[PDB]
Amino acid sequence: VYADSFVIRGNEVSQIAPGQTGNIADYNYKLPDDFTGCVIAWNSNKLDS
Amino acid sequence: LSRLDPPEAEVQIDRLITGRLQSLQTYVTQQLIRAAEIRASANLAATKM
Secondary structure, three states, rough: OOOOOOOOOHHHHHHHOOOOHHHHHHHOOOOOOOOOOOOOOOOOOOOOO | OOOOOOHHEEEEEEHHHHHHHHHHHHHHHHOOOOOOOOHHHHHHHHOOO
16 A cells, blocks of 8 residues: 545546646656546635635 | 546446457457368368369
């Protein structure tokens, strides 16, 4: 198991998937096209807002 | 490989490879049938000679 973590917008989580393109997908964090695993996200306004 | 992104081009590449292999398998089968026919004709021609 390797586990990664980070903070992003709500709609921006759409970019977290294999082979995607975008600001996060291209210039901050990119998943390999053959990535296997799970992507997990949740609201964090109570903390990060 | 230029319009679509790596992991959504794969099912497309997979389908293209399947279609191009199914068109070659039948070609090889027809070639084998025609080669068997030519071999029978050549055996008959050699017997006649």
